[PDB]
Design a protein around this ligand. Structure first.
Ligand code: OKV
Ligand code: MN
Ligand code: MN
Length: 245
């Protein structure tokens, strides 16, 4: 038995190969887990649950089949899809969780999050995140016509793509002090997150004991997942979908 953790799939229409790899994962590996946690950035973009984007319903139906197969699915918002709301949760059967959750996984206490709130050195993103996460700014954006939200989101992506082109990767990683503060705020020796796209297992010190930070990988050329069993924690890389010469 095991619990699965995925994040940073960045599903979008222009990347059907990633979509097909995620659909195969939901039909096979996901059906065998006690639970499936999606730690943010499931979608490359999200402007509201009323978006009739067909990929949204194709993904919701596939996740609903996993939930119907007896595997509960949970979602934590990422920096790309923080607008995923209760309507999509019902369409997909997923349970939406807070920005930080503490799980009892077979005895070990694990803190789960997306990981973007750990990059406290990036003042540019932190200001952008505080703005787009303010409730009244959200409900104003969501009240606009959908085609207006599309033009807003398209320009903001082009704006941030040209602004991030002049940023150093030293202020864009995880802050080590923020990890210890989070792992001691929740009193855990285990932390799983994504966002940074650097799959790794980092050892640190928290609560006077050794602690570990498990980072998920983004779904680029191949898939990535964290598998937590009663015996071990596994960081797994696998292809989306054999011959001889
Ligand atoms: C660093 C980073 O995370 N970025 C950089 C660029 C980007 C674009 C998108 S998005 O295209 O999915 N879309 C953009 C618009 N957005 C929004 C929400 C609430 C209020 C408003 C405002 F401001 F218009 F009122 C806009 C919803 C999501 C998501 C993440 C990110
Ligand atoms: Mn990501
Ligand atoms: Mn992210």
């Amino acid at each position: 038995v095991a619990t699965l953790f995925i994040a940073d799939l960045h599903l979008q229409t222009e990347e059907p190969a990633i979509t097909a790899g995620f659909l195969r994962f939901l039909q096979g590996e996901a059906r065998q887990a006690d639970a499936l946690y999606i730690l943010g950035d499931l979608f490359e973009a999200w402007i509201g649950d009323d978006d009739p984007n067909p990929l949204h319903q194709q993904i919701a139906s596939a996740i609903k089949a996993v939930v119907d197969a007896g595997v509960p699915c949970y979602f934590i918002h990422g920096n790309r899809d923080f607008l995923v709301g209760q309507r999509f949760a019902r369409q997909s059967g997923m349970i939406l969780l807070a920005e930080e959750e503490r799980l009892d996984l077979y005895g070990r206490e694990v803190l789960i999050m997306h990981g973007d709130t750990l990059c406290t050195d990036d003042q540019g993103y932190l200001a952008f995140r505080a703005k787009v996460h303010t409730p009244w700014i959200q409900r104003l954006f969501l009240a606009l016509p959908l085609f207006i939200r599309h033009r807003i989101a398209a320009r903001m992506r082009a704006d941030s793509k040209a602004a991030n082109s002049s940023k150093s990767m030293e202020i864009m990683d995880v802050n080590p002090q923020a990890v210890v503060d989070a792992m001691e705020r929740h009193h855990v020796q285990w932390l799983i997150h994504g966002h940074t796209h650097r799959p790794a297992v980092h050892e640190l010190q928290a609560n006077g004991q050794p602690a570990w930070r498990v980072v998920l990988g983004a779904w680029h050329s191949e898939g990535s997942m964290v598998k937590v069993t009663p015996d071990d924690v596994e960081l797994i890389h696998f292809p989306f979908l054999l011959y001889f010469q």
